[PDB]
């Protein structure tokens, strides 16, 4: 019984966490009342990984909400599934940070870190075997990313033998109109490269393009981006929430998908892509699903895996299919003399099989790739860092709080070194 303590910081992180919880509640079979009305034995086979055992068979999530203002904390408490969460799991302040990393990491963040670690320890003590920690947040805000990095560092210092997962979200100009989002994006990346094991990059530019073109939406909002993020998250943790022949361990999965301790960034994808309301279209075969999941269009990141090198790949299918079909497909794809040869799939994919598809779909597939193309994203924000740091724009907001230009130079050097290492390993021999 491996228990994973879930965490969600910032407005975007809290919203993504709530959406993912509400999505998996319908798959596991737990009504929002806090009881299980599911009719499948496989559902309760691994429910303890994300739910606690209370009196009367009531399942309580393991999430820990954290913020610096109360607005979003109040919206989730009154949401469709706002009763399952414990009232004492909501930690918040009043003033917020103000889209400032120094104010959300060193002042208010470090001020509420005590109350947050209180609940973190209270939750960790109620677990038979703790596996790791998960956090959902963004990188274009102050409170969110600041408190996320601070809590990650604290959990690493107090629990060095625990895995860390961060479903960080990369901002984009087409979604936000804030000028200091590059600075906060650079600092969080520097902190994560030092205190993280897994980082699922979820670009906010790829999701917007998908919602605008694929879904054919006139004016997409955060509701068309959060649904996709929650769907991808549910598709990623399909093995960690249900049985499976493949090894569904978090530590072993991270070890196999983290061959490099600085290139631990993973691009996640999922086909078929659906919107809100309309989700029951058709049932795609295994070949079509594999072709769509490995397509740059079904990628949550703005980078294309084809423009790089495949280091590690993890595929997870769910629906009504046998492992033999997936194995034959994956073996014929790499066969250069077959009639189904492609040029965007490596010669080793960790395939998985499941019998519990999501809601509104009969079959689904998820892919996670440690390709080097993600470096492109690291170069997209870096350029912006050069169009501000050189002019010292809005630097009095950071230096006035306590930060030094020595912290900015170190973060820039770390980002440059990461990009250089990625580009260097991209040119390695494929032996």
């Amino acid at each position: 019984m491996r228990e994973i303590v879930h965490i969600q910081a910032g407005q975007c992180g809290n919203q993504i966490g709530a959406k993912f919880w509400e999505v998996i509640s319908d798959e596991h079979g737990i009504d929002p009342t806090g009881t299980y009305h599911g009719d499948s034995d496989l559902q309760l086979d691994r429910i303890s990984v994300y739910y606690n055992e209370a009196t009367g068979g009531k399942y309580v999530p393991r999430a820990i909400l954290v913020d610096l203002e109360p607005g979003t904390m109040d919206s989730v408490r009154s949401g469709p599934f706002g009763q399952i969460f414990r009232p004492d799991n909501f930690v918040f302040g009043q003033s917020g940070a103000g889209n400032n990393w120094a104010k959300g990491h060193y002042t208010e963040g470090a001020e509420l870190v005590d109350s947050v670690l209180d609940v973190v320890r209270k939750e960790a003590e109620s677990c038979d075997c703790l596996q790791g920690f998960q956090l959902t947040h963004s990188l274009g805000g102050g409170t969110g990313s600041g408190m996320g990095t601070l809590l990650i560092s604290k959990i690493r210092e107090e629990y060095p033998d625990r895995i860390m997962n961060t479903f960080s979200v990369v901002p984009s100009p087409k979604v936000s109109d804030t000028v200091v989002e590059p600075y906060n994006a650079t600092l969080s990346v520097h902190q994560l490269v030092e205190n993280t094991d897994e980082t699922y990059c979820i670009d906010n530019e790829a999701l917007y393009d998908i919602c605008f073109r694929t879904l054919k939406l006139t004016t997409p909002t955060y509701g068309d981006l959060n649904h996709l993020v929650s769907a991808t998250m549910s598709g990623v943790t399909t093995c960690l929430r249900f049985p499976g022949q493949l090894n569904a361990d978090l530590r072993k999965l991270a070890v196999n998908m983290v061959p490099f301790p600085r290139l631990h960034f993973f691009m996640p994808g999922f086909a078929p892509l659906t919107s809100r309301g309309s989700q029951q279209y058709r049932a795609l075969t295994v070949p079509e699903l594999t072709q769509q999941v490995f397509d740059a269009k079904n990628m949550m990141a703005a980078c294309d895996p084809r423009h790089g090198r495949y280091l590690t790949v993890a595929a997870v299918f769910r629906g009504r299919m046998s492992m033999k079909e997936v194995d034959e497909q994956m073996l014929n794809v790499q066969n250069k003399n077959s009639s189904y040869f492609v040029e965007w799939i490596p010669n080793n994919v960790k395939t998985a099989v499941c019998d519990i598809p999501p809601r509104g779909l009969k079959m689904a597939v998820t892919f996670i790739g440690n390709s080097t193309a993600i470096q492109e994203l690291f170069k997209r924000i870096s350029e912006q860092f050069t169009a501000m740091f050189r002019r010292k724009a809005f630097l009095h907001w950071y230096t006035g709080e306590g930060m030094d230009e020595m912290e900015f130079t170190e973060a820039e050097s770390n980002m440059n070194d990461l990009v250089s290492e990625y580009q260097q390993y991209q040119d390695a021999t494929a032996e």
Partner: protein
Amino acid sequence: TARLLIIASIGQLKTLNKCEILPEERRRAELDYRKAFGNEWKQAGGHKDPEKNRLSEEFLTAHPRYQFLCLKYGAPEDWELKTQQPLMLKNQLLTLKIKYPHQLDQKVLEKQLPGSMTIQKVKGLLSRLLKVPVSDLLLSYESPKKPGREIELENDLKSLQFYSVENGDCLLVRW
């Protein structure tokens, strides 16, 4: 491929060729047997309707363990018995219409482009046709599904399928 059938022909075969059989093995073998013999079940007079299921005798003698599986995991659907055909270039072409907002008096041109055709080749074709430089030809499209909403094709290394292009769209050329 034959082993899975053997386990599918016997119900209480817990061991075969000195190898234990698990529920995973039983389910894999039972899903393969249904995936392989679904097509024939339709032709033999099969239908999901519990009152319109009238199968012949030969199909029953050849598959006397196919009716129990029909109830164990339901009957095969129509979308599960269409995986025996390859693809052709004819099935990858997109019929689009070429328009010029600046010159409306021109006729409505129509072309057929592959699905994986990059924007670079389309720009080169348009330059060779209209005799316009490649750097002076901007590209957009409109779909009958999304009317009055123009999109931009600023990236040239991408393909038409990445931009969500489908049969029936219309391209607009400006210079």
